[model samples]
Target: KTFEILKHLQADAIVLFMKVHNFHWNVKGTDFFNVHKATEEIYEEFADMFDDLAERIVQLGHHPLVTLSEAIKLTRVKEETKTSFHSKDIFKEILEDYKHLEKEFKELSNTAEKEGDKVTVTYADDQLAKLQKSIWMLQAHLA
Candidate 1:
């Protein structure tokens, strides 16, 4: 059960990363520079996170889903096909995604603690710390 959750979270992380990367390059408006920079930072963190989650799954004796199709099938994060450039909208929307992930990570950490999986517990905690900070900043920007 825990491993299944990890794979889905890993997939979600990568899907989220791809969309943010897409938006980073294509975003525009007066806030283009800020959106671009913020997206770059966020996607970079996600790149690390997805990889770590995949490796963690491997340590748990499961193969990480590597294909886009597989990720799409398993992930909760939705894919964006249109190129949108509203900085405020992007910040506002992506903020919600982070909040969703924050909840999941909290659950994952708690479950891992109960399961005696120190590595996953630490992983979720670290990601939670970053996501919490990002949520604060994004919320501030939207305000």
Candidate 2:
């Protein structure tokens, strides 16, 4: 069960990284400074995310995949091309990705709950809330 938890979390980490990478490449305009800053901050967050989830997988007695090839195979998040998009469009795209990630995390959380893994369930629930809040913040910026 813990193996399942780690596997799902690993998958999610890949997806999150992909989304952040996309946001990093496409942000533009007068707010480029702010958006670039935000993307940098988010990339740092993903670095932590990479460490935490990989550690969790190891704790569960499994080796985590760390390479780009590994991520491509494991991730459910689709790859997006590096298109030059407007800042608002980029924000909207990232917002949608977060919404999608939140849904996937919810499903994983439900599985963890069913398996009686309190720690994983709690982590997923908290993360879902955070991602939802992030999506709302992006939407508010657009509005």
Evaluated with lDDT, which candidate comes out highest? Answer: 1
lDDT of each: 0.88, 0.73
* Residues 1-143, model 1: lDDT tens digits: 67877988999889999989888988879888888888998898889889999999999998999898999999988788877668887887789899889988998999888889998888889989988998999999988
Q: Using Cα atoms with residue i matched to residue i, what is each candidate's TM-score against the true structure? A: 0.94, 0.83
Off by over 4 Å in 1: none
Off by over 4 Å in 2: 1-9, 15-19
TM-score of 2: 0.83
- Model 2 residue 121 lDDT? 77
Say which candidate scores most in TM-score.
1
lDDT of 2 by residue, 1-143 (tens): 55655565576566676667677777767777788778777767666766777886776568888777777777766766766666787777777767876886787688778888787777778878888888889999899
Question: Distance from true position, residue 78, model 2, in Å?
Answer: 2.1
